[PDB]
Amino acid sequence: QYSPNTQQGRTSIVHLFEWRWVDIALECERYLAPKGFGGVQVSPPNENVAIYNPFRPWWERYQPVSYKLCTRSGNEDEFRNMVTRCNNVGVRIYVDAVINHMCGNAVSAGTSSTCGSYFNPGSRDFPAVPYSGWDFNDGKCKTGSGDIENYNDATQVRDCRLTGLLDLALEKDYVRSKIAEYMNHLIDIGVAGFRLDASKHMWPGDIKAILDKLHNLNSNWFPAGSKPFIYQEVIDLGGEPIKSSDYFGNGRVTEFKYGAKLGTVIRKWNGEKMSYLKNWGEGWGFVPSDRALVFVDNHNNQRGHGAGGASILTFWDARLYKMAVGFMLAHPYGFTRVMSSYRWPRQFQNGNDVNDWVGPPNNNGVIKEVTINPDTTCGNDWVCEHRWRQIRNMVIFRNVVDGQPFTNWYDNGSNQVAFGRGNRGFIVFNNDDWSFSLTLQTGLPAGTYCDVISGDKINGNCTGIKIYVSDDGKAHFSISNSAEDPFIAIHAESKL
Ligand SMILES: OC[C@H]1O[C@H](O[C@H]2[C@H](O)[C@@H](O)[C@@H](O)O[C@@H]2CO)[C@H](O)[C@@H](O)[C@@H]1O
Numbered sequence: 306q307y308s309p310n311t312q313q314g315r316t317s318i319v320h321l322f323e324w325r326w327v328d329i330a331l332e333c334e335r336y337l338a339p340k341g342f343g344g345v346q347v348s349p350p351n352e353n354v355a356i357y358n359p360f361r362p363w364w365e366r367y368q369p370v371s372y373k374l375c376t377r378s379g380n381e382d383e384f385r386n387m388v389t390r391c392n393n394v395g396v397r398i399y400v401d402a403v404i405n406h407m408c409g410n411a412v413s414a415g416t417s418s419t420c421g422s423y424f425n426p427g428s429r430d431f432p433a434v435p436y437s438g439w440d441f442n443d444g445k446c447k448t449g450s451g452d453i454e455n456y457n458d459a460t461q462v463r464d465c466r467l468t469g470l471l472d473l474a475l476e477k478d479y480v481r482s483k484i485a486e487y488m489n490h491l492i493d494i495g496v497a498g499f500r501l502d503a504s505k506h507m508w509p510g511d512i513k514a515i516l517d518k519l520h521n522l523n524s525n526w527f528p529a530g531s532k533p534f535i536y537q538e539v540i541d542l543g544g545e546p547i548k549s550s551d552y553f554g555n556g557r558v559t560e561f562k563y564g565a566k567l568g569t570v571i572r573k574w575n576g577e578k579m580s581y582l583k584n585w586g587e588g589w590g591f592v593p594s595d596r597a598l599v600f601v602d603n604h605n606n607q608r609g610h611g612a613g614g615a616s617i618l619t620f621w622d623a624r625l626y627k628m629a630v631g632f633m634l635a636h637p638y639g640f641t642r643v644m645s646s647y648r649w650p651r652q653f654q655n656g657n658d659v660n661d662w663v664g665p666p667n668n669n670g671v672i673k674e675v676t677i678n679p680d681t682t683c684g685n686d687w688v689c690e691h692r693w694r695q696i697r698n699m700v701i702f703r704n705v706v707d708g709q710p711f712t713n714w715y716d717n718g719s720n721q722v723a724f725g726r727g728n729r730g731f732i733v734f735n736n737d738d739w740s741f742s743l744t745l746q747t748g749l750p751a752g753t754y755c756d757v758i759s760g761d762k763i764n765g766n767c768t769g770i771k772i773y774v775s776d777d778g779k780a781h782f783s784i785s786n787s788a789e790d791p792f793i794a795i796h797a798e799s800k801l
């Protein structure tokens with residue numbers, strides 16, 4: 306459950322948030338495969354509640370109605386088509402599994418679901434599965450509201466309703482079997498792993514029980530005996546009775562302190578500075594690297610919905626964002642997930658975004674197609690950070706120096722730091738309010754390298770900056786604090 310199941314040489318996965326199956330399938334063939342991306346985390350593929358007030362929010366996909374592969378992203382046949390096409394070109398698919406609960410207990414009964422299945426929250430009736438009042442924790446929860454009220458009580462956090470969401474009785478074998486039946490359907494189709502949503506709200510033991518009933522990955526694409534990659538969404542910042550380590554036996558966990566801390570460091574908040582990143586990783590109290598799934602931002606914190614807070618860096622802060630993602634992809638700590646978002650009308654009212662619910666670009670509910678501009682960018686309001694040259698080239702950088710030790714560290718005691726990865730890559734950052742101009746030891750073989758942040762290497766030429774490494778491995782670097790991108794990265798595959 307700890308290995309991504311990616312093809313050799315691919316070290317990152319990208320979250321194509323709310324994308325349609327047909328668009329992901331094309332992206333796999335025309336872009337992800339040739340650019341070295343390892344896999345794609347997709348939005349929940351199972352039927353959810355269609356919420357019209359507000360109008361089709363992104364979070365409606367976290368309110369299951371059944372396990373039918375029928376959503377705004379497409380139907381079962383399109384889902385199968387995408388997984389097959391992606392696998393065939395070497396890019397894995399990771400499914401967002403919402404198995405801790407069903408929909409809001411106050412949602413009206415009827416057929417307001419992405420696939421028209423009938424449901425009745427009030428009587429706990431989900432005939433499309435089927436589930437009944439017997440399959441929920443209504444009797445198990447002890448709070449007077451039926452919802453979670455105190456997060457210092459590990460018991461209610463697991464047996465009570467998370468913000469009113471009908472909480473499934475995951476201890477019952479019937480329930481575990483229904484969920485496993487859904488998950489095995491996905492595995493046989495070709496998926497390589499799963500993101501387990503709201504894992505902190507499920508007992509680690511119930512999760513194991515469910516994982517016990519799972520098949521091995523599809524033998525047409527994976528080696529015999531391969532287990533699905535598992536990463537659980539556990540929001541664990543400081544002192545809480547529940548800890549991330551409680552889930553190490555099921556697979557990896559999301560390390561939410563990663564982005565929260567990196568964000569305040571890059572922003573230079575509360576006295577933090579880049580020179581402190583010298584012992585980044587476990588040194589900062591993070592979970593062991595072999596159990597970590599890291600990221601700068603996620604879909605549920607880039608819009609204030611969760612762990613991270615105000616330090617969280619997103620595409621809205623493009624300059625600092627690229628630099629944070631650049632640092633993450635260059636540093637050996639954890640397995641990295643890249644975010645891919647859509648733009649929405651941010652509308653702050655007293656420091657809070659009142660439009661944080663807004664769903665993907667659409668036309669009366671129908672998700673808009675991801676268009677590709679002649680300059681390789683995306684249209685129709687899709688940000689496509691994974692297509693930004695600076696992010697894209699850092700994704701390749703991580704593949705190139707994979708397995709190389711963190712070495713040749715340098716810092717000016719403030720926010721000008723550099724470090725290498727064995728003799729395969731080197732990166733330099735300038736986050737101070739003055740220019741950087743110094744000759745550094747790179748640990749790389751002499752030669753001319755193309756800077757992959759400002760440009761690309763093409764048939765024997767660079768389209769951006771060029772770095773000259775001498776016989777002694779030294780190279781001069783000049784970065785203005787006013788530079789578009791105050792960082793430079795070079796690697797073995799960018800050598801001319
Ligand atoms: O009880 C239903 C619940 O739905 C929405 O909650 C969202 C939550 O805001 C998102 O962060 C994500 O976790 O999915 C949840 C389920 O859709 C509403 O925002 C919330 O007020 C409401 O009670």
Ligand SMILES: [Ca+2]
Pocket residue numbers: 405462463464465472473506507
């Ligand atoms: Ca629960």
Ligand SMILES: [Cl-]
Pocket residue numbers: 538559603
């Ligand atoms: Cl996550």
